[PDB]
Amino acid sequence: SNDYVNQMISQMTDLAKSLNVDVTELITSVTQALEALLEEYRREGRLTDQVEKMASSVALQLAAELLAQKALEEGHDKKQTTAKRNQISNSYSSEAMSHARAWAASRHSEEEAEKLAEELYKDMKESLKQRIDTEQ
């Protein structure tokens, strides 16, 4: 929705401020990559509300890791930049996995749900990262 995209962009701008780097160039690449991933998941019948929320969390994790690299390239302090990156990335990967586990718990047996949630995160992050890099 409009609110889903705007919420993601708001959070991306927050993490950009934290890392002291301009969010501008990544907004286009991340929004386009996220849109394309969601359309693929929808077409294939893989999308649910928790999966959509998870995808925003993963996009934000990747934005933080990419923006932190640009902060290092711009000369920002390495210890502070990487500490902030790691805190932000940890927060978003934790959020993403919490959505993944909620998706899996109502749909799969207790035995396989953990592995499928882990696999969903891995596959989703790999796909988004490839899509973001293609746009960039």
Residue numbers in the entry: 3 to 138
Sentences from the paper on this structure:
Here we introduce Chroma, a generative model for proteins and protein complexes that can directly sample novel protein structures and sequences, and that can be conditioned to steer the generative process towards desired properties and functions. Given backbones from this diffusion process, the Chroma design network then generates sequence and side-chain conformations that are conditioned on the sampled backbone to yield a joint generative model for the sequences and structure of a protein complex. We sought to characterize the space of possible proteins parameterized by Chroma by generating a large number of unconditional samples of proteins and protein complexes (100,000 single-chain proteins and 20,000 complexes across two versions of the models, v.0 and v.1). The experimental characterization of 310 proteins shows that sampling from Chroma results in proteins that are highly expressed, fold and have favourable biophysical properties.
We reasoned that the best way to determine the plausibility of the protein space parameterized by Chroma was to draw independent samples from the model and test them experimentally. Our experimental validation shows that Chroma has learnt a sufficiently accurate distribution such that sampling from it results in proteins that express, fold, have favourable biophysical properties and conform to intended structures at non-trivial rates. The crystal structures of two designed proteins exhibit atomistic agreement with Chroma samples (a backbone root-mean-square deviation of around 1.0 Å). Moreover, the two designs with experimentally determined crystal structures demonstrate that a non-trivial fraction of this distribution should be expected to be atomistically accurate.
